[PDB]
Amino acid sequence: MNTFSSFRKHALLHSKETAVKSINHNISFYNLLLLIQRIATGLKSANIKKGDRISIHMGNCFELIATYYACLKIGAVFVPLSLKLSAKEVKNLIQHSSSCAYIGDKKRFYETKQEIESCTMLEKIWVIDLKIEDKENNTHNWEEIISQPYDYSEDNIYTDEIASIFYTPKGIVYSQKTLIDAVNLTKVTINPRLPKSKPAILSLVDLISPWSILITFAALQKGYSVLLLSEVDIENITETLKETQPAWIAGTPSNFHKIIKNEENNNNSLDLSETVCVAGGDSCATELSQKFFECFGSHLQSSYGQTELGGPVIYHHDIYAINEPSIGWPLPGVEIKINNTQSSNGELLIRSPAKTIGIWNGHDIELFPSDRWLATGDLVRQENNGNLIFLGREKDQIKIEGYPVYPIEIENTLIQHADIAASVVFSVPDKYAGERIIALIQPQKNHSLKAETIASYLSDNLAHYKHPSEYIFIKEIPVNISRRKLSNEYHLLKSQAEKVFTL
Numbered sequence: 002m003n004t005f006s007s008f009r010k011h012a013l014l015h016s017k018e019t020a021v022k023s024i025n026h027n028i029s030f031y032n033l034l035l036l037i038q039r040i041a042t043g044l045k046s047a048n049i050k051k052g053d054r055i056s057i058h059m060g061n062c063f064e065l066i067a068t069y070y071a072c073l074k075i076g077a078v079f080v081p082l083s084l085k086l087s088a089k090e091v092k093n094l095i096q097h098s099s100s101c102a103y104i105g106d107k108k109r110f111y112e113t114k115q116e117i118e119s120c121t122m123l124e125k126i127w128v129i130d131l132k133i134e135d136k137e138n139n140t141h142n143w144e145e146i147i148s149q150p151y152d153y154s155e156d157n158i159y160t161d162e163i164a165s166i167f168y169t170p171k172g173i174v175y176s177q178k179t180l181i182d183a184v185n186l187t188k189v190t191i192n193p194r195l196p197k198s199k200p201a202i203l204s205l206v207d208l209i210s211p212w213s214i215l216i217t218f219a220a221l222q223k224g225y226s227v228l229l230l231s232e233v234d235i236e237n238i239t240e241t242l243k244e245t246q247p248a249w250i251a252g253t254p255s256n257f258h259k260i261i262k263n264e265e266n267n268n269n270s271l272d273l274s275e276t277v278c279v280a281g282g283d284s285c286a287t288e289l290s291q292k293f294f295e296c297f298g299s300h301l302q303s304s305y306g307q308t309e310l311g312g313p314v315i316y317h318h319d320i321y322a323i324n325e326p327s328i329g330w331p332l333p334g335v336e337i338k339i340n341n342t343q344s345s346n347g348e349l350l351i352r353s354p355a356k357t358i359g360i361w362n363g364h365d366i367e368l369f370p371s372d373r374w375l376a377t378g379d380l381v382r383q384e385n386n387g388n389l390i391f392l393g394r395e396k397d398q399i400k401i402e403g404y405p406v407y408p409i410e411i412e413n414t415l416i417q418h419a420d421i422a423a424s425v426v427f428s429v430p431d432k433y434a435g436e437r438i439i440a441l442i443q444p445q446k447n448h449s450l451k452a453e454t455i456a457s458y459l460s461d462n463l464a465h466y467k468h469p470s471e472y473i474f475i476k477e478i479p480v481n482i483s484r485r486k487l488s489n490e491y492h493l494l495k496s497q498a499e500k501v502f503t504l
């Protein structure tokens with residue numbers, strides 16, 4: 002069962018239930034299938050064929066998810082163009098991907114119009130809410146692609162065929178099978194609670210971005226509705242969440258930090274205690290989970306994955322339950338190897354059951370040996386129960402007397418202190434020790450804090466060789482965090498510090 006046919010099967014058996022909703026709109030499973038079918042007929046009527054590449058360039062709307070499924074239905078390769086791309090970058094991807102069609106919305110098209118229309122390989126350009134004076138040459142209004150009824154023509158889709166190209170300047174090629182296996186990984190990470198009185202799934206990452214594509218396919222295949230928000234909706238996220246009350250929210254760590262910060266004001270208070278929230282990336286969200294529980298009483302989850310691995314590969318279904326920084330457990334079929342360093346800690350290597358096909362180089366696919374391991378650049382230790390303790394980036398590792406020291410582990414200890422609001426640990430060169438550990442300490446509250454408190458606190462909680470040699474008290478840590486750039490600004494930091502304490 003490929004991704005479209007899995008959607009279809011569910012839509013035909015659960016026709017009346019809401020598949021997608023926004024603040025002002027909704028569409029049932031059955032009507033979304035009808036829209037997908039009309040788009041498929043319009044594409045084929047416009048001479049789009051299995052294997053043709055379609056660049057897709059639009060904000061969150063029902064047409065975006067319908068277009069993904071229409072491409073899948075007919076075997077057209079979809080090429081999502083991130084909304085963060087400049088006009089020159091969008092043109093580069095349209096050209097590099099060898100797209101022969103483009104589908105976009107009004108805002109994205111008109112920001113990029115001259116570039117898109119100068120891509121001479123584009124035989125069809127469809128634009129939602131195209132201005133009528135611009136319907137000419139190969140540029141068409143979106144309504145044209147759905148104007149004809151479904152023609153019931155067959156499609157022969159095979160799981161080894163290309164389905165999509167997800168650009169990181171590297172076009173990662175997914176087959177129909179990659180997408181099946183990536184959605185199957187993602188399905189394991191979407192676990193709303195049982196309602197008390199139907200779950201709606203929200204992803205705060207744009208639907209043009211691969212993690213949200215997978216979340217959306219997986220949610221619909223589990224029969225959940227998907228809530229789509231606009232940029233303005235997400236700028237007003239606290240009020241939007243009170244109104245829409247999703248059961249499950251995916252987002253970046255930054256998304257959830259902002260949600261936390263909005264509560265410091267407000268009044269009516271947003272109740273996320275029953276909501277399952279999933280922070281997504283290539284790091285660890287343990288400190289965020291502590292803040293998120295304090296603020297909402299909700300138990301943050303995390304997902305760790307990347308496009309080259311097809312989908313999510315490691316999932317932490319309860320970050321806050323683990324006192325150490327951790328990233329969770331490998332998903333089903335995921336294989337891991339921890340590089341042997343003659344110790345329990347090493348680089349995390351991953352092989353995923355969602356095998357990408359290769360890299361599109363503009364002219365051909367550079368094929369991936371299906372046995373390849375991906376080196377993540379992250380250090381881990383695997384506990385007895387499988388949980389991957391997170392030791393930080395390999396390149397942030399500090400050496401003390403020959404032994405590796407991990408800033409993220411020291412930071413996690415420091416912030417548990419009631420008087421410490423935040424902390425960043427890094428090293429500086431030292432003529433005779435090689436490196437020396439510095440701790441940037443941001444005092445909590447409106448409170449006072451003496452370094453001697455910290456050194457004694459660390460004696461009880463950390464091995465001595467992991468201890469900072471020096472404390473820099475500053476009541477705002479520079480963010481925008483790069484322990485490398487902070488090391489480079491060590492003398493500046495000391496000169497701006499509330500106080501410095503050298504042991």
Ligand SMILES: CCc1cc(C(=O)O)c2c(c1)C(=O)C=C2
Nearest residue numbers: 211281282304305306307308313
């Ligand atoms: C589709 C591959 C993938 C991409 C990304 C991303 O941050 O872009 C993420 C994950 C998977 C994930 O499990 C959490 C973040």
